Amino acid sequence: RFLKVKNWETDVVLTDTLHLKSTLETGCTEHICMGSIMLPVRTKDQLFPLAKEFLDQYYSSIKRFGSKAHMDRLEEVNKEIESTSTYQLKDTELIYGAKHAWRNASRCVGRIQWSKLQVFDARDCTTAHGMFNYICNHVKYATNKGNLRSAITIFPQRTDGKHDFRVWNSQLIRYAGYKQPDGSTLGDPANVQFTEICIQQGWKAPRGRFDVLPLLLQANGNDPELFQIPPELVLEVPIRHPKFDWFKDLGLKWYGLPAVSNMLLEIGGLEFSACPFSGWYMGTEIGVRDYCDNSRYNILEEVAKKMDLDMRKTSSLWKDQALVEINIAVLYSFQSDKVTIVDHHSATESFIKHMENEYRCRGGCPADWVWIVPPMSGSITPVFHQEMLNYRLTPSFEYQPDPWNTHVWK
């Protein structure tokens, strides 16, 4: 069954056959759509078919499907599974898998860049200190003095579920948050709970508005351990406005490396619970969400005041006005400091070309509209007008529960 997707701004119609290979569930049914819902140890029994599916995709991608190399590998893996209950991926398969989990990430608007991904094989790591070293090298390589390079570091896969490797931080770089006795919060409200764990674990918090949190690393299922990322390795950008000279006095800055560290990478049925990855920011992640979400730095008012906007009634659109300036500032500061960043128009225009390319050469591109459309100026970006089909393909990146809610402390 072929599915048609239309762009109501250009009438370009596309056909999707790719979804026919989808296997996982979406959370929706023929009676209800869960499209805006944020979150809707394997057995030998279930593992081999997952491995086969993967190795077939892999061997077909290199044009060796049916080859002896392909057949042998299938027998090798199969034997290994029956022999050990699991199996190890060749380096080539790991790189391929990692790149494809990104290619399949329907919530990611930056996928045009999917084939350019530096993969760091950290499967030989055994300790938290070991993890710390691998992560510092990832941060340095990735930051590349402001000229960002996409990368991912992959730690040992899950075995019995009692020896998981995990990066407790949700992102490698984020600012601490502190709940004050008067109910106010200093720093980033999103990280208050994690910040409490770090402090409890021994972190000496400077209790400021932009303190970089310490890495909290768990190796082989052991209790996690704290590590400070060398400051010289954390690239930061002071935020200022090209016209509003008072903007800088707002005392704002943000880090340049966005590195998701709490997701699970699944390849051939194998689970990589610690797989920190990074690209570069789209301006609105910082300017719209991090700075203006009511539950984050919530800076709209203050910026609103300084601009002396009519804040008496919402219909003045004072919030919308301050929002644009804040985002103008973030983009301005990053470009001035020569730190890679992409605006929402560029990013979405690019995703549109990527998507079209993918329908033609791949037969589709799963995409989650709800996440793809930028948090500001939605309809003046091309993705707003683009019908998208969302389905799950593997390899893929999945959510997993927070470690503090599952870990058995030793």
Ligand X SMILES: C[C@H](O)[C@H](O)[C@H]1CNc2nc(N)[nH]c(=O)c2N1
The verdict on 288 binding ligand CCCCNC(=N)NO (CB under 6 A) reads no
- Of 361-390, which residues contact ligand X (CB under 6 A)? 370-371, 384-387
The verdict on 186 binding ligand CCCCNC(=N)NO (CB under 6 A) reads no
- Of 194, 155, 156, 201, the C-alpha closest to 173 is 194
Task: Give 53 or 387: the residue with its C-beta nearer to ligand X.
Answer: 387
- Degrees, nearest 5: CA angle 395-53-152: 25
Q: Which of 111, 158, 166, 240 is catalytic?
A: 111
* Placement of tokens 């000496």 in the chain: 204
Task: Give 24 or 33: the residue with its C-beta nearer to Zn ion.
Answer: 33
Which of its own copies, Zn ion, ligand HEM, none does 36 bind, CB closer than 5 to 8 A by kind? Answer: its own copies
How far is it, in rounded angstroms, from Cα 170 to Cα 256? 16
Give residue 11's region: left, alpha or beta (phi > 0; psi -120 to 50). Answer: left
Residue 108 falls in the annotated catalytic set: yes
The verdict on 102 binding ligand HEM (CB under 6 A) reads yes
Q: Number of C-alpha atoms within 13 angstroms, CB side, residue 252?
A: 25
Contact 195, 177 (CB under 8 A): yes
180 is in an annotated binding site: no
The verdict on 311 binding ligand X (CB under 6 A) reads no
* Placement of tokens 């050469």 in the chain: 361
| Residue 108: CB minimum distance to Zn ion, A | 19
Task: Give 11 or 30: the residue with its C-beta nearer to Zn ion.
Answer: 30
- Of 350, 352, 390, the C-alpha closest to 370 is 390
| Residue 20: CB minimum distance to its own copies, A | 9
Task: Give 109 or 376: the residue with its C-beta nearer to ligand HEM.
Answer: 109
- Of 29-68, which residues contact ligand X (CB under 6 A)? 36, 38
Paired tokens of 131: 């993890």
Number of chain residues interacting with ligand X (CB under 6 A)? 9
Gaps after residue numbers in the chain (C–N over 2.5 angstroms): 40
- Helix locations, 114-273, DSSP H: 128-143, 192-200
- Of 359-378, which residues contact its own copies (CB under 8 A)? 368-370, 373-378
- Degrees, nearest 5: CA angle 67-70-75: 125
| Residue 38: CB minimum distance to ligand X, A | 5
- φ/ψ (deg, to 5) at 336: -60, -40
Amino acid at 337: D
Which of ligand HEM, ligand X, ligand CCCCNC(=N)NO, none does 259 bind, CB closer than 5 to 8 A by kind? Answer: ligand CCCCNC(=N)NO
Binding site for ligand HEM (CB under 6 A): 102, 105, 107-110, 113, 117, 150, 152, 260, 277-280, 282, 285, 342, 347, 371, 397
Catalytic residues: 108, 111, 280, 285
Give the residue numbers of the binding site for L-arginine. 171, 280-281, 285
Give the residue numbers of the binding site. 36, 108, 171, 280-281, 285, 370-371, 384, 399
